[PDB]
Amino acid sequence: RFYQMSPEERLASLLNEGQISADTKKEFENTALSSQIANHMIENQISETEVPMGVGLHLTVDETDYLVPMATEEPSVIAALSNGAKIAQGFKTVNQQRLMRGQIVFYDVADPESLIDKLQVREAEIFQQAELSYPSIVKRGGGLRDLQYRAFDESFVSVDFLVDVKDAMGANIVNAMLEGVAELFREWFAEQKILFSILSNYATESVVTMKTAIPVSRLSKGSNGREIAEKIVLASRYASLDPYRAVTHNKGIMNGIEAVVLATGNDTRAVSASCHAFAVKEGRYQGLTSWTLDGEQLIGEISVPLALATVGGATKVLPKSQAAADLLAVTDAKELSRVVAAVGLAQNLAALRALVSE
Amino acid sequence: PRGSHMLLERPQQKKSRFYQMSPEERLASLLNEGQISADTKKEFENTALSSQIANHMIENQISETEVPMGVGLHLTVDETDYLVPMATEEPSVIAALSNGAKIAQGFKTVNQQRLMRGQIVFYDVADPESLIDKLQVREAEIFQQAELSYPSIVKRGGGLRDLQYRAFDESFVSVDFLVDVKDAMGANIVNAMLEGVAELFREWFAEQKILFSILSNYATESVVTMKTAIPVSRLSKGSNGREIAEKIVLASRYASLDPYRAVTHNKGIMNGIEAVVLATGNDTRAVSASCHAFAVKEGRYQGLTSWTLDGEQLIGEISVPLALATVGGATKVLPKSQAAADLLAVTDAKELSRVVAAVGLAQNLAALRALVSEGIQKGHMALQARSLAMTVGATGKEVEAVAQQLKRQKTMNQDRALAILNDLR
Numbered sequence: 001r002f003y004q005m006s007p008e009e010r011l012a013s014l015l016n017e018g019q020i021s022a023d024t025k026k027e028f029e030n031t032a033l034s035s036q037i038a039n040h041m042i043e044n045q046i047s048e049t050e051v052p053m054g055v056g057l058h059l060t061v062d063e064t065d066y067l068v069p070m071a072t073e074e075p076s077v078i079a080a081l082s083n084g085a086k087i088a089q090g091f092k093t094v095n096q097q098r099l100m101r102g103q104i105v106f107y108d109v110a111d112p113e114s115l116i117d118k119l120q121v122r123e124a125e126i127f128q129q130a131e132l133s134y135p136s137i138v139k140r141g142g143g144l145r146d147l148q149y150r151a152f153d154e155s156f157v158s159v160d161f162l163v164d165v166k167d168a169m170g171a172n173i174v175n176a177m178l179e180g181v182a183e184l185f186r187e188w189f190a191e192q193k194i195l196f197s198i199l200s201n202y203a204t205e206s207v208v209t210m211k212t213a214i215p216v217s218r219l220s221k222g223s224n225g226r227e228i229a230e231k232i233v234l235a236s237r238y239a240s241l242d243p244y245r246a247v248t249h250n251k252g253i254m255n256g257i258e259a260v261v262l263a264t265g266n267d268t269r270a271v272s273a274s275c276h277a278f279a280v281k282e283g284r285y286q287g288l289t290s291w292t293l294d295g296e297q298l299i300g301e302i303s304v305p306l307a308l309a310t311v312g313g314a315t316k317v318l319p320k321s322q323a324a325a326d327l328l329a330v331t332d333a334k335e336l337s338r339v340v341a342a343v344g345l346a347q348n349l350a351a352l353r354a355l356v357s358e
Numbered sequence: 359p360r361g362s363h364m365l366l367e368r369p370q371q372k373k374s375r376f377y378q379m380s381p382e383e384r385l386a387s388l389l390n391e392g393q394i395s396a397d398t399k400k401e402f403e404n405t406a407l408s409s410q411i412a413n414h415m416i417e418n419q420i421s422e423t424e425v426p427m428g429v430g431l432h433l434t435v436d437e438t439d440y441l442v443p444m445a446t447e448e449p450s451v452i453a454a455l456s457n458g459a460k461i462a463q464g465f466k467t468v469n470q471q472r473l474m475r476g477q478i479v480f481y482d483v484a485d486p487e488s489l490i491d492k493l494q495v496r497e498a499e500i501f502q503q504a505e506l507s508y509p510s511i512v513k514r515g516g517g518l519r520d521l522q523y524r525a526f527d528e529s530f531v532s533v534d535f536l537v538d539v540k541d542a543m544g545a546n547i548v549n550a551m552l553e554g555v556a557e558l559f560r561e562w563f564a565e566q567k568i569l570f571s572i573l574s575n576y577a578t579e580s581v582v583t584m585k586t587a588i589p590v591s592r593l594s595k596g597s598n599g600r601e602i603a604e605k606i607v608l609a610s611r612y613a614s615l616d617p618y619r620a621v622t623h624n625k626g627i628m629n630g631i632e633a634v635v636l637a638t639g640n641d642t643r644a645v646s647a648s649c650h651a652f653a654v655k656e657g658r659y660q661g662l663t664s665w666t667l668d669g670e671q672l673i674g675e676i677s678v679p680l681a682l683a684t685v686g687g688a689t690k691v692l693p694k695s696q697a698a699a700d701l702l703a704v705t706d707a708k709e710l711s712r713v714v715a716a717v718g719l720a721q722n723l724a725a726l727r728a729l730v731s732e733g734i735q736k737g738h739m740a741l742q743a744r745s746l747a748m749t750v751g752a753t754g755k756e757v758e759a760v761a762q763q764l765k766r767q768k769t770m771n772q773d774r775a776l777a778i779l780n781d782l783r
């Protein structure tokens with residue numbers, strides 16, 4: 001019955017059964033998100049978590065000014081972003097891509113190559129079925145983009161689906177498309193077995209690279225601008241050597257990125273999973289940014305998979321997500337990813353500069 | 359050309375900088391400079407967290423993000439029943455956690471440690487092996503200064519516990535500090551302790567140079583491992599319980615071969631873990647950072663859980679570093695954190711980490727069972743049909759009736775769910 005009760009009835013049941021105090025109940029009742037919206041978004045809803053939201057300052061991306069909504073519970077995070085962006089002055093997009101990835105995994109595959117060669121010769125029909133399983137995205141101008149195949153040891157075979165989901169995160173688009181094609185596969189190969197069909201959150205085809213060039217004089221109010229830069233460069237390289245520093249290094253970056261992702265109603269677990277997994281380069285967890293000295297300029301670069309969204313999920317139904325989107329005022333998801341990647345690099349600059357200046 | 363940033367438009371210099379203004383003044387300035395609409399300003403003004411609390415926690419505060427919070431059910435850890443506060447915006451996460459916990463019935467602790475790491479890193483070290491030995495013999499005084507740099511923790515029963523040393527590139531040296539921060543996360547306890555020990559490191563060695571002294575979020579000494587044992591019959595409403603178990607084992611095994619699946623595998627785990635971390639006012643970045651880095655094993659990003667078959671039993675196990683906290687940070691200054699803490703009803707941070715790890719394993723179970731059984735979509739659409747019913751006003755047993763009819767529709771809507779509801783009345 002608990003999952004069938006109203007929020008008001010669930011709180012009363014919790015109090016009646018001694019599971020929460022009376023003051024705890026009154027606090028759970030002090031909400032600002034409409035009960036209608038919250039109760040229909042999740043299950044067993046009783047209340048809300050309120051995260052303070054502030055405005056990150058001085059971010060410029062490709063000669064466009066931005067005001068960054070940042071939801072965070074940690075002090076100094078928004079100030080660090082603002083000081084880091086002010087010092088950097090601007091950020092420039094080195095390259096951007098935006099495709100989502102999914103997979104259908106066969107198991108107990110007798111001869112992998114046989115199965116794979118079978119699929120490659122019928123790719124036209126697969127694209128046909130993928131359109132039928134979600135035709136709306138194809139009308140918007142997206143849809144399936146490529147098919148890839150990977151044969152693994154232990155008799156696994158993965159069919160990789162790369163999709164253009166436009167401004168959505170794409171989970172429900174990709175999952176629907178994959179389950180529809182899975183049916184066709186089971187019709188084509190009654191012999192074979194399908195372990196699962198699901199989207200991959202490792203969005204290596206949604207990577208964004210930002211960069212910044214900083215006159216070393218801006219790194220200090222005084223004369224030791226180059227000294228601070230040389231130590232920033234040293235700190236960044238040590239992240240490539242000590243995972244115990246790289247994790248803190250990337251955590252500092254995600255303080256800014258996850259604040260914007262949260263404020264705009266995007267999925268924080270998805271972005272945190274892809275970014276940290278993308279940090280694994282050459283079998284070692286390293287930093288997501290590089291800092292080098294080219295003459296009298298400190299040059300920083302960031303590369304992160306940012307399959308973010310401006311539509312779908314919680315980006316619209318939560319009024320605060322719409323308000324944060326009004327403040328940021330990005331026109332599409334690709335732009336959101338560029339702004340978020342710049343926030344990451346700005347956060348990292350403020351963190352390293354403070355780390356080596358003390 | 360290169361004009362300045364549009365923020366220097368927000369200052370009221372005829373009087374005040376943005377970071378000095380009050381939240382109300384900061385919103386008025388935002389509206390007057392064309393950055394937000396009137397409706398957006400009013401929505402920002404609709405807040406439940408005290409303005410005095412929010413404004414003094416962060417900088418340039420203007421409003422708040424509201425994440426719905428629900429209650430996960432059926433979780434049992436070490437023969438104790440729990441009600442898990444879960445803060446999330448994703449549908450089905452809480453229902454899946456309840457389903458996964460119900461299927462497993464309970465979780466037990468295999469091992470647990472709780473120590474926060476810190477590091478003081480030397481750079482430009484000529485002979486690393488020399489400086490190291492020069493430090494190992496003076497550990498008696500290193501432990502003493504650590505106590506005076508932050509004595510409060512030592513009288514509460516904690517403080518520095520161990521010192522280890524590593525060298526990289528034959529030019530870097532790192533002094534590793536293992537600290538017991540009790541129920542706090544330990545960031546400010548460690549940092550202050552390390553910056554104080556760095557001082558005498560300079561006094562001792564005017565020859566060497568320190569690059570930085572700071573905590574490490576990679577809390578490999580806060581790993582907690584949870585276990586579960588499920589009769590295969592509980593994995594299906596039908597008769598193929600074992601078949602399902604066999605598929606879950608392979609899905610878990612496949613995660614260990616394809617990082618593209620492992621990331622999604624751990625993402626599902628973190629849907630539950632981060633939802634409790636957020637509800638209790640803990641630092642979500644620190645947990646996801648240490649958890650995903652811990653996922654890297656033998657030079658390969660893999661799944662954080664293992665699933666194996668032992669006779670008629672499906673055996674699941676999770677291992678993650680959870681340096682969570684029950685005090686400090688945002689665990690108390692945020693009233694909702696205290697309310698969520700009253701519901702979870704844990705006594706210490708060690709118990710918090712144990713419950714959160716179990717939540718992760720239960721979450722993993724629900725996802726994997728659905729993926730290898732009917733698929734992830736069927737469950738989602740069903741919850742979506744019920745949500746669309748309550749939106750239009752479905753009550754009582756009309757919730758399932760309207761959801762049943764929405765299933766028949768090729769495309770479910772709020773426009774059509776209202777039509778179904780009115781006919782029933």
Ligand SMILES: CC(C)(COP(=O)([O-])OP(=O)([O-])OC[C@H]1O[C@@H](n2cnc3c(N)ncnc32)[C@H](O)[C@@H]1OP(=O)([O-])[O-])[C@@H](O)C(=O)NCCC(=O)NCCSC(=O)C[C@@](C)(O)CC(=O)[O-]
Nearest residue numbers: 003043044450451453454456457622623626724725728737
């Ligand atoms: C969604 C269910 C639970 C449907 O549930 P069902 O299969 O129809 O079975 P049921 O309705 O008879 O009851 C299932 C139990 O789940 C709970 N439950 C059931 N319905 C509700 C509800 N309305 N409100 C609250 N709780 C609910 C409830 O505890 C219930 O038992 P009971 O308490 O009644 O004895 C099932 O399909 C399921 O578990 N799906 C898993 C979906 C999931 O894991 N979602 C997480 C977000 S998606 C994700 O993780 C991404 C992913 C999957 O890609 C990660 C990965 O790949 O690993």
Ligand SMILES: NC(=O)c1ccc[n+]([C@@H]2O[C@H](COP(=O)([O-])OP(=O)(O)OC[C@H]3O[C@@H](n4cnc5c(N)ncnc54)[C@H](OP(=O)(O)O)[C@@H]3O)[C@@H](O)[C@H]2O)c1
Nearest residue numbers: 136165166167168169170171172173199267311312313448
């Ligand atoms: N593996 C995973 O991690 C996983 C698994 C399951 C669920 N999820 C969750 O599923 C959600 C993300 O998936 P989703 O975005 O596809 O949900 P969605 O809300 O159903 O899809 C996007 C919505 O935005 C609309 N839209 C408007 N303009 C669009 C545009 N330019 N491009 C694309 N769509 C546009 C779409 O309309 P049309 O239908 O007409 O196209 C659609 O209704 C998140 O809540 C996520 O956390 C994640």
Ligand SMILES: NC(=O)c1ccc[n+]([C@@H]2O[C@H](COP(=O)([O-])OP(=O)(O)OC[C@H]3O[C@@H](n4cnc5c(N)ncnc54)[C@H](OP(=O)(O)O)[C@@H]3O)[C@@H](O)[C@H]2O)c1
Nearest residue numbers: 074510511539540541542543544545546547641685686687
């Ligand atoms: N790299 C990073 O992640 C990083 C860096 C810097 C800061 N931070 C932030 O710093 C905060 C976490 O650090 P913190 O935990 O040390 O915050 P904290 O609030 O300063 O420390 C814990 C507080 O709880 C009190 N307390 C009561 N009972 C305790 C117990 N059993 N054990 C420990 N403390 C107890 C302590 O009293 P006493 O004062 O007497 O000791 C202290 O005031 C977070 O806001 C975090 O995001 C993170």
Ligand SMILES: [Ca+2]
Nearest residue numbers: 146147148149
């Ligand atoms: Ca191809």
Ligand SMILES: [Ca+2]
Nearest residue numbers: 326329393394
């Ligand atoms: Ca605007």
Ligand SMILES: [Ca+2]
Nearest residue numbers: 520521522523
């Ligand atoms: Ca030792």
